[PDB]
Write a protein that binds this ligand. Structure first.
Ligand SMILES: Nc1ncnc2c1ncn2[C@@H]1O[C@H](COP(=O)(O)OP(=O)(O)NP(=O)(O)O)[C@@H](O)[C@H]1O
Ligand SMILES: [Mg+2]
Length: 333
């Protein structure tokens, strides 16, 4: 199916109100309207998120709104055995980290996803099924991969059956929200700006046919990606190549060229090869600032978001034969 695209407009901050910077971003349903400072440009997306102001009430509603629309679906995708990915893209200060991680007072997607994950595994585990949860957390800076849960820099390779992976990146089993919160909290403290963070959850769902004792695995993966600022040769390579990737895959999603998609020209696009054009259910959250002083970066974000929704993915359930048979036998009962 198509890459899902959401656009999130952060509200006017105090500086923009104090200095009379004009608000140029309007939203109506799932349409974004960019006004000039010379015709109104209208973009259409799957979802649009916006807030009336920065009050606690509106911010609480905003984070809940994003999770209700994107968080639940990606959680469900992982429980159905899909690789799923949310990546936030946009100018610095537009809301990428606020959306993906949030703050202590305003938790974002990742805290809610981790809470819902363990809520669900602990609710659903029974004689017919169990769940294993493993997390990795890594950062891409200057085309180098650092392990945030810890071999000073790690190499990307791609296996013909396993896909791209980070050689030597720790993958830690977790059994509760507090385990994973403590890991993400220490990863969060180990950052380095123009870097990309990737939070990866692997959900292994073992199904058991109690009559036979046969068992099988269905593996879901969550990739929660908080990219570097889109406004910005090594240090920009991943960001620049993602633009080309999105453009090339978007052309193919229609009928232009037929089109060098340069996945392996950067660490970021190589590790996201499946997330874009491959075996994944993927959502983009494009974050934009609302006011006149960012009109141009906003337009550029809106445009890449506009192309990204023409990208075609081919997601399959990642399960062994026993898991598929045992699962179907359970859906029949
Ligand atoms: N949707 C939102 N609603 C309310 N406030 C927001 C929202 N998005 C961002 N903010 C505010 O904007 C500030 C900057 O957001 P932030 O998520 O750090 O941007 P960023 O895209 O990650 N910048 P950068 O890491 O430098 O590329 C935060 O302190 C929030 O107060
Ligand atoms: Mg950030």
């Amino acid at each position: 199916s198509k890459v899902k695209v959401a656009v999130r407009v952060r509200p006017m901050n105090r500086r923009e109100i104090d200095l009379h910077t004009k608000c140029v971003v309007d939203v109506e349903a799932n349409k974004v309207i960019l006004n000039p400072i010379g015709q109104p440009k209208i973009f259409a997306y799957d979802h649009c998120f916006w807030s009336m102001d920065e009050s606690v009430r509106e911010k609480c509603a905003g984070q809940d709104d994003v999770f209700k629309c994107l968080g639940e679906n990606i959680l469900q995708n992982a429980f159905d055995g899909y690789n799923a990915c949310i990546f936030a893209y946009g100018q610095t200060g537009s809301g990428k980290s606020y959306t993906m991680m949030g703050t202590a007072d305003q938790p974002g997607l990742i805290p809610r996803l981790c809470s819902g994950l363990f809520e669900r595994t602990q609710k659903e585990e029974n004689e017919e099924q169990s769940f294993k949860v493993e997390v990795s957390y890594m950062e891409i800076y200057n085309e180098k991969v650092r392990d945030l849960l810890d071999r000073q820099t790690l190499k990307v390779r791609e296996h013909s059956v396993l896909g791209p992976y980070v050689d030597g990146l720790s993958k830690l089993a977790v059994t509760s929200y507090k385990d994973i919160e403590s890991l993400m909290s220490e990863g969060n403290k180990s950052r380095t700006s123009r870097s990309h963070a990737v939070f990866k959850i692997t959900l292994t769902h073992t199904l058991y046919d109690v009559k036979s004792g046969t068992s099988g695995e269905k593996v879901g993966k969550l990739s929660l990606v908080d990219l570097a600022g889109s406004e910005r040769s090594n240090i920009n390579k991943s960001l620049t190549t993602l633009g080309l990737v999105i453009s090339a895959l978007a052309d193919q999603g229609a009928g232009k060229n037929k089109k060098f998609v340069p996945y392996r020209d950067s660490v970021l696009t190589w590790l996201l090869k499946d997330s874009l054009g491959g075996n994944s259910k993927t959502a983009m959250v494009a974050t934009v600032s609302p006011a006149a002083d960012n009109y141009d970066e906003t337009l550029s974000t809106l445009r890449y978001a506009d192309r990204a929704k023409h990208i075609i993915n081919h997601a399959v359930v990642n399960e062994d034969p026993n898991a598929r048979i045992i699962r179907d036998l359970h859906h029949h009962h």
